[PDB]
């Protein structure tokens, strides 16, 4: 009640006094204003020019409470818009917070961790700026214990989250040496028993694997794939989501990198993923599948062996359109690099009808994708001399009607392929 609902001008008055305790009192009052969920007066506090004062309070070693209160107040200012975070940075908060990482008071170093997390989370520039100030060493030292379980849950969760922000964002991606420096601790967090630490550890790994093959390799070589695959089967959605994202990122790389995902036993989880109630999970799982069917023939064969083709037929038959679109890609990739037998197996699974039905979609791009898949399947049928057997299949399900109509489509690329099919296999 003492420091509850102060006016900004009273806070300004207490902070401008030459009384450290008065300043502490005013700072707490500011912290409480900024701690409210309904429109905290962040811009009002900034306009009052209180930031430089807060920053100086960070270095008041003899008055830890005011160190804590200002750190908390600055954290919440830094949690706002880019402009508001910039204000905190502009005040010299970065080095001051990094100095607090070594505080003997756990709740104060934690607040510093939290603050740096918000600053780094703004984007690439501030992220790299926090790194240049040398935040990584002191951050990792806080996690350098024989067993993470001895750390307070909240403390560990904050450390993990802040680290994940240091791994986040592109253009540019985090510095290579920074990633290398962080990875070993990150891998360790990836094995912790706490659901929130696991979720944010997966997000970190997902950020790191979201780039060129070299970035993917840095992570893969650390041997995290088996663990990712395991977390991929976790019950918690917040864990599955980032885990799937990471696996999805990894299979966009080389065939060898993709193979590690397969060897880890990832495909066995996909019967669930491809039928998951959360559409975002279905979409990303199908997307992941499309990048696997874009692999080698022995990898396509692994997809067949795990009985995932029927699941692709299902998603193609019924699913959120965005998911169905990833399924169309999955089939086209499959038919592009697959053997004749593998492609034939596709048809026997019933891929044709659900494929034809999606030719009624208004998305020009999916029509192009489907038409290419058809071409590929006919080419496989040509080597068997059974193109006609396919023509009847497509005709009986009302596919020919749609291909014919696609000749009067408005898009150049579409009708070209349409008539090519029409006059080559249907005349």
């Amino acid at each position: 009640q003492g420091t509850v609902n102060w006016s900004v001008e009273d806070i300004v008055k207490g902070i401008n006094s030459n009384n450290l305790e008065s300043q502490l009192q005013a700072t707490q009052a500011a912290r409480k204003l900024l701690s409210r969920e309904k429109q905290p007066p962040i811009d009002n506090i900034i306009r009052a020019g209180l930031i430089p004062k807060f920053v100086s309070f960070l270095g008041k070693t003899d008055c830890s409470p005011i160190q804590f209160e200002s750190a908390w107040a600055l954290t919440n200012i830094a949690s706002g818009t880019s402009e508001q975070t910039k204000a905190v940075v502009d005040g010299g908060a970065i080095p001051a917070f990094i100095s607090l990482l070594a505080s003997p008071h756990a709740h104060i170093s934690e607040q510093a961790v939290w603050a740096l997390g918000n600053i780094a989370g703004d984007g690439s520039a501030f992220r790299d700026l926090v790194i240049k100030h040398g935040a990584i060493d002191p951050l990792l030292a806080l996690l350098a214990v024989p067993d993470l379980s001895t750390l307070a849950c909240g403390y560990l969760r904050n450390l993990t989250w802040t680290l994940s922000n240091l791994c986040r964002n592109k253009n540019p991606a985090p510095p290579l040496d920074a990633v290398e420096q962080i990875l070993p601790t990150l891998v360790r967090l990836l094995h912790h028993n706490d659901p929130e630490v696991l979720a944010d550890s997966c997000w970190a790994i997902s950020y790191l694997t979201d780039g060129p093959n070299e970035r993917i390799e840095m992570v893969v070589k650390k041997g995290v794939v088996p663990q990712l695959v395991k977390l991929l089967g976790a019950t918690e959605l917040p864990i599955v989501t980032p885990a799937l994202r990471a696996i999805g990122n990894i299979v966009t790389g080389t065939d060898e990198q993709t193979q590690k995902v397969i060897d880890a036993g990832a495909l066995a989880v996909f019967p669930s993923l491809l039928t998951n109630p959360k559409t975002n999970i279905q979409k990303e799982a199908t997307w992941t599948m499309s990048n696997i069917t874009a692999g080698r023939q022995d990898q396509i064969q692994q997809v067949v062996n795990h009985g995932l083709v029927p699941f692709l037929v299902g998603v193609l038959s019924k699913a959120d359109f965005k998911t169905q679109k990833e399924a169309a890609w999955a089939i086209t990739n499959y038919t592009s690099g697959g053997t004749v037998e593998q492609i034939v197996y596709l048809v026997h699974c019933g891929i044709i009808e659900p494929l034809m039905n999606l030719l009624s979609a208004k998305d020009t791009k999916i029509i192009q994708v489907i038409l290419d898949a058809i071409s590929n399947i006919f080419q496989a049928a040509e080597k068997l001399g059974e193109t006609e057997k396919l023509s009847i299949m497509i005709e009986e399900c009302g596919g020919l009607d749609k291909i014919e109509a696609l000749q009067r489509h408005e898009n150049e690329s579409v009708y070209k392929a349409s008539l090519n099919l029409i006059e080559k296999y249907f005349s």
């Binding site: 908390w72 706002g80 703004d122 989250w161 990122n249 790389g253």
Partner: peptide, 14 residues
């Protein structure tokens, strides 16, 4: 074929 590729801030409340 080829392969196709694809909260940051937290306020501390009571």
């Amino acid at each position: 074929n080829r392969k196709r590729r694809g909260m940051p801030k937290r306020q501390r409340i009571p």
